[PDB]
Write a protein that binds this ligand. Sequence first.
Ligand SMILES: Cc1ccc(-n2nc(C(C)(C)C)cc2NC(=O)Nc2ccc(OCCN3CCOCC3)cc2)cc1
Ligand SMILES: CCCCCCCCO[C@@H]1O[C@H](CO)[C@@H](O)[C@H](O)[C@H]1O
Length: 331
Amino acid sequence: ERPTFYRQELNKTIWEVPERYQNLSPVGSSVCAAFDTKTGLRVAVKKLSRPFQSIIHAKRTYRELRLLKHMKHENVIGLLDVFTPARSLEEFNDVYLVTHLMGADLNNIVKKLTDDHVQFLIYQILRGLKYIHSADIIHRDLKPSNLAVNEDCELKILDFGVATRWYRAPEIMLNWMHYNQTVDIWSVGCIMAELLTGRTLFPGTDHIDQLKLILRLVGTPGAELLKKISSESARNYIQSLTQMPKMNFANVFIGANPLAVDLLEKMLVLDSDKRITAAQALAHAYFAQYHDPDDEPVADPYDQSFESRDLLIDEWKSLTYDEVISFVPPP
Ligand SMILES: Cc1ccc(-n2nc(C(C)(C)C)cc2NC(=O)Nc2ccc(OCCN3CCOCC3)cc2)cc1
Ligand SMILES: CCCCCCCCO[C@@H]1O[C@H](CO)[C@@H](O)[C@H](O)[C@H]1O
């Protein structure tokens, strides 16, 4: 049966939720922390904003719900519940997502950390990324504020949807036509470095300053990378730069665990084809105390074919409705 709903206003916004959820309190703007009476858990409830206003919003709504329904891994946000107060498709206009409430984000603890903490936090990030990447999902926006952490140091990857640019792989800023999942490894590299040093690795003021700072560390592209650049304009510009060697990372990251330094060198490589993968990184010596090859699961395949489709607002709306109706909560 349909739960009984109750209405209230929170920060200019109306909230209509199952009575199951008590004590709503805003956190971020929209999201409320709440008490879930059925499980005894503190939960986060996200009310989507104008989910079906346009085709763009409608497809984004569907994209987010479909993805969240798929995620079933300890180090990735999961869906505890999804509901709408609507009793039918015709009046369906609002979507609420329920997830576990975590203590804070990584931006609000590195606002620096011991090596054992770095090992454990980066391990869990990689473990979640192995999972996301095995489903052919690319995060694309990994940064400390997209990582939620408890006082246990348990970590989950999320995407709320501290500048994004600072953690972005250089190919994304060169507007590269295609890019692959190791863009996320670049981001992990940036995050790990910042945890070890307590300073943003590459605090660029814009995308040009960003690449400038990046090339300073990793050096200008070599012959082998240049071979793979199809853009005339980019090739010419890159080749016209004053050439710089890759820095020695052990001197950049002075006093850091040598295993950590080694890992960083394997993550922060300009040529994306040469970066360590998440699955390979888990087997790196730096994570020797946490690595367990039989507890680093992959994901079921995830069908993203809908991304290539151009549908009407009411079609994306109906598809999202079906997804709300078919939701099966975790045990
Ligand atoms: C359009 C869109 C937007 C976001 C996503 N997305 N993607 C992912 C992954 C699987 C790739 C990491 C996750 C999301 N969506 C997502 O994390 N939504 C979400 C859900 C709840 C949120 O609550 C913010 C409050 N936090 C802080 C307290 O601890 C946990 C909850 C914030 C964001 C997918 C599509
Ligand atoms: C001045 C900075 C130059 C940045 C060069 C970025 C190189 C990124 O690496 C490239 O990633 C592509 C996208 O997945 C792959 O198709 C290429 O094979 C790979 O070399």
